[PDB]
Amino acid sequence: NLKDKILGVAKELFIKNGYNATTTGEIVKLSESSKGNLFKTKENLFLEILNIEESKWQEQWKKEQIKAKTNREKFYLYNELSLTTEYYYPLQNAIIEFYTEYKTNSINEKMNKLENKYIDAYHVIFKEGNLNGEWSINDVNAVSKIAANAVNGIVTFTHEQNINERIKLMNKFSQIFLNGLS
Amino acid sequence: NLKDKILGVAKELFIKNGYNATTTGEIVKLSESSKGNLYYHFKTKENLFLEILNIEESKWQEQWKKEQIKAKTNREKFYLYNELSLTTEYYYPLQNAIIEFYTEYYKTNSINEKMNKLENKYIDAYHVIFKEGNLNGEWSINDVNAVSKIAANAVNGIVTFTHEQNINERIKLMNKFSQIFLNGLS
Numbered sequence: 001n002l003k004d005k006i007l008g009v010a011k012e013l014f015i016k017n018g019y020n021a022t023t024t025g026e027i028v029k030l031s032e033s034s035k036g037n038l039f040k041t042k043e044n045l046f047l048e049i050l051n052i053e054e055s056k057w058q059e060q061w062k063k064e065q066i067k068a069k070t071n072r073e074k075f076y077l078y079n080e081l082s083l084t085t086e087y088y089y090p091l092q093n094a095i096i097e098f099y100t101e102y103k104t105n106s107i108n109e110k111m112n113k114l115e116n117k118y119i120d121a122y123h124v125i126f127k128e129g130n131l132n133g134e135w136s137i138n139d140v141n142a143v144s145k146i147a148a149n150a151v152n153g154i155v156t157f158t159h160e161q162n163i164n165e166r167i168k169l170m171n172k173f174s175q176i177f178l179n180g181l182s
Numbered sequence: 183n184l185k186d187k188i189l190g191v192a193k194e195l196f197i198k199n200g201y202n203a204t205t206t207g208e209i210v211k212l213s214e215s216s217k218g219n220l221y222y223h224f225k226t227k228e229n230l231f232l233e234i235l236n237i238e239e240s241k242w243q244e245q246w247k248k249e250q251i252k253a254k255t256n257r258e259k260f261y262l263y264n265e266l267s268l269t270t271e272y273y274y275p276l277q278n279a280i281i282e283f284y285t286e287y288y289k290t291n292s293i294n295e296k297m298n299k300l301e302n303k304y305i306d307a308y309h310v311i312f313k314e315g316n317l318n319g320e321w322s323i324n325d326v327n328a329v330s331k332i333a334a335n336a337v338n339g340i341v342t343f344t345h346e347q348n349i350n351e352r353i354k355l356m357n358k359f360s361q362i363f364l365n366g367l368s
Contacts, residue, residue, distance in 0.1 A: 016289070016363075017286075018282070018285040018286060020202075020282070036262075070215075073243075078225065092343075093284070093285040094285070095283050096342060096343075097281055097282070099345055099346070100277075100278055101346070102346065108346060115346060120251045140360070142355060142358055143358075144356075145344070146223075146358055146359045146362065148183075149340045149343045149344055150336035150339050150340060151336075151339065152343050153335045153338050153339015153340065153342065154332065154335045154338050154339065155339075156335075156342075157301075157335045157338055157339065158331070158335055159288070160288070169328060169331055169332050172324055172325070172329070172332055175285055175366070176265060176332065176363060176366040177362060177363070178366065179363035179365070179366030179367075180208070180361075180362035180363055180364070180366030181362060181365075181366075
């Protein structure tokens, strides 16, 4: 598929090099296509990929959260898998570089849904954890944001060391966090 | 000094135009130095930049030294250090050059080396907070080096990915996190 071949190449460059490094010229180069083809704007093509990868990851979580009976377990598992997936999280460096370039209102709103789809996972976990009586979170939305970000950090800023120690820290985190929720 | 001048001009160049667009040539001429001198002192731009970061680390460190006197107990120093990490970063000019630099060398073991001796330094701060926290029964951590790495990165995540809303809200979430976190300790 040509349209999904650009989506393919781009994603690659966006991960390897940054959002800046990757240029519309290259995307075309390694695609045997042409500017005339493209996906009008670059930030358009990019946010497209974010959506995809966001969805791919969210789905996998589902076809996977099954192995977790308690929401406490759900929390741990989500944080762990974050470290191993091949979806969304491998693009954080790129996302960051992008964000530092949030002025055009047609963005923070065009991403307001990407922001929530990313914290939802934790929303469900925390809320249903209240429904299931595993803890007592008043400010759910907050904790969800707090967690989504703390985790994204452990995942993003330690991507330079034994993948198994990361999983160890990450688990110690989940431990620490949930223990503090009451 | 001619070394210090190069570091200074370079820090400004990077800030005004970012890492990638800044050439060692600009740096040479504006610091009134020489390609030779710059090679001798830093070999590469990448190395030059690491040295600046290193210097900033020191400054941050000394700055934190003066500031923690505001927080009597370690529990407090924890709360404070994170707040500072979030607010100071909001208006740190080098941040942009740093981002650029990272997402450009975080796939090169070479630079990735020092990047760690550097990161580690950022982490010591927490290590001290937590160690001292023990010696005062503020808590009992037995895996300090870890909780420290945990904190340093969880907090950096909040700071770096929260970027998307009013500054007061971020500060609130950061403080909430510090509350939760210090709660699940012992």
